[PDB]
């Protein structure tokens, strides 16, 4: 599945969007 | 697992914020 991460997507993943959660933005990673 | 769904989470899914992904806003549902 895809994940929300901070600060960034990790090795093995790439960014395909942004999440909004708990007052901050997150990378959306798959 | 968690997934972006539209327009809302279903059944027992718990929302963890919002996806900004693929031209749309989604509920992020676990």
Distance CA B17, CA A13 (A): 20
Output the CA–CA distances (angstroms, integers) from residue A30 to A2, A17, B11, in the order listed.
Answer: 4, 9, 25
CB B11 within 8 A of CB B2: no
Any CB–CB contact under 8 A between A5 and chain B? no
Tokens of B17: 């914020």
Closest-CA distance, B20 to chain A, in angstroms, reads 5
Torsion angle (degrees, nearest 10) of CA B13, B15, B19, B25: 90
| A21 close contact with B: CB closer than 8 A | yes
Whether the CB of A15 is below 8 Å from some CB of chain B: the reply is: no
Name the structure determination technique: X-ray
CA distance A7 to chain B (A): 16
The span from the CA of A3 to the CA of B19, in Å, is: 10
């Amino acid at each position: 599945a895809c994940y929300c991460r901070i600060p960034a997507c990790i090795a093995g993943e790439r960014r395909y969007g942004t999440c909004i959660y708990q007052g901050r933005l997150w990378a959306f990673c798959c």
